[model samples]
Target chain A: VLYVGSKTKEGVVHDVTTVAEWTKEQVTNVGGAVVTGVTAVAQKTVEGAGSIAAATGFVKKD
Target chain B: VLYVGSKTKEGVVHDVTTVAEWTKEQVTNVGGAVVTGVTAVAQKTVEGAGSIAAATGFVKKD
Candidate 1:
């Protein structure tokens, strides 16, 4: 039998395969959120700053 | 600035550093548990099988 397990912060033990599957799900979810957030922020900046060049300047200034 | 974050199974987001720290702690805890478990099982096998050589034979037979 293969020995594999995951231990949580509370010292709870669980199957490692389950933990890995959860990790992948979270990674995909978080990646989608980041892409959406960045796109929204960039669009808002371009609109507010008047041009892509101005948006780039704003980002560079930060 | 570094962009780093972690998302939970419930879609809760938090700092990645904290997540990494928790990961390390859990890894350590799980490793210790595995070590203890393996040691106990080996010791028990040695005792029950009558000798280290017999224990090896038993393990090989499995």
Candidate 2:
């Protein structure tokens, strides 16, 4: 199972359950950088999920 | 309680249910684009029991 968990930098604990699917445009909106570090567990389950971050062929490093 | 789960792009289901304060820095890392339509139910409970039994592993998505 690919685990997904997110918290604001302040650790607010934003609970997320279902993701409809991935799309090109949608992925473009949230900005790829934020979705890359979605936890090591998430990275392992859905490695491409991270790729989608850069699929737009653009990279934003923090 | 918050729920967090995930899977690969192979029509997988990654469940998550937590969000903290938004930080530009963190959001920037994860390609926050994929998590646009994040919907959840039953935000709070009044000292409830047997809320959710357990959380881990894979899920099937339609």
Candidate 3:
């Protein structure tokens, strides 16, 4: 059979397909976050806000 | 800070960057395997082999 897998540092071999799917989901979620951040920044810019926290909606941004 | 993470079923959150790196490594390994498989298949074809195992170099292929 055509088999594909990922061998981890812990000597565990994970199904490549599963890893691929997980990766895709993670990337999509990150992309969604980026879009949300950009939208928030745009809104803050329009409202003439200056705080970094206001731009990112994250206290860590301060 | 701009933070990204992946929450697992066990309520564990993993760094997105780490997951992305792992995914890229897994994909590259998978791609290498595909190239190897294709090369083996081509070699078998040129040698006029008929067995599925010969084509894939895997007993499961039989």
Candidate 4:
């Protein structure tokens, strides 16, 4: 139930969704914005929902 | 050979390592730092060596 939207430069770049609703344009964005040429963006998510944890950490030379 | 260090408030609060070396005192920490009272800290790395790509992302309502 939390949605904030941004991304500018004439095209409306995208991300951050499970696509449960919001008029149903078939949008399943995940973890907000990230753009490079439209200038730039942040907030990326794709593992687990809202408190934002599915427990994955790393460090390997093996 | 990439080692940096920080922690304050009378305790050595910690994480982030594969602990390959650094005098063999045996510290295998992982993923940087986080503090609340003695101010704060950051730099979390534990995702496959220096390139840091073990790859983990988040978003799950399923």
**Which candidate comes out best when scored by TM-score?**
2
Query: After best superposition, candidate 3 residue A30: deviation in angstroms?
Result: 35
Model 1 segments more than 4 A misplaced: A1-20, A24-62, B1-25, B29-62
**Tens-place lDDT digits, model 1, residues A14-54:** 22111211222121221111111111011111122222211
If you score just chain A, what TM-score does every candidate get?
0.13, 0.15, 0.15, 0.13
Listed per model in order, the count of residue pairs whose N, CA or C atoms clash below 3 Å is 0, 33, 3, 24
Encode model 1's per-residue lDDT on B1-62: one tens digit a residue.
Answer: 22234221321122211111122212121111111111101011112122231111011122
lDDT of 2 by residue, A1-62 (tens): 23356322211133344332332232234333223223312211212222231122234353
Interface RMSD of every predicted model, in angstroms: 28.9, 18.3, 26.8, 22.8
Q: Which regions in candidate 2 have their CA more than 4 angstroms from the true location?
A: A1-57, A60-62, B1-10, B21-62
Query: Best candidate, lDDT-wise?
Result: 2
TM-score for each of the candidates = 0.12, 0.16, 0.13, 0.13
The superposed Cα distance between candidate 3 and the true structure at residue B47, in angstroms, equals 7.1
| A1: Cα error in model 4, Å | 39
Instruction: Select the stronger candidate by lDDT from 3 and 4.
Output: 4
The residue-by-residue lDDT of candidate 3 on B4-55, one tens digit each, is: 3422121111222211223322222221112111110111111122322112
Model 2's CAPRI class is incorrect
Q: Is the docking of candidate 1 incorrect, acceptable, medium or high quality?
A: incorrect
lDDT of 4 by residue, A6-35 (tens): 222221223322212222122222232211
Question: For every candidate structure, what is the RMSD over all alpha carbons to the true structure, in angstroms?
Answer: 28.9, 18.3, 26.8, 22.8
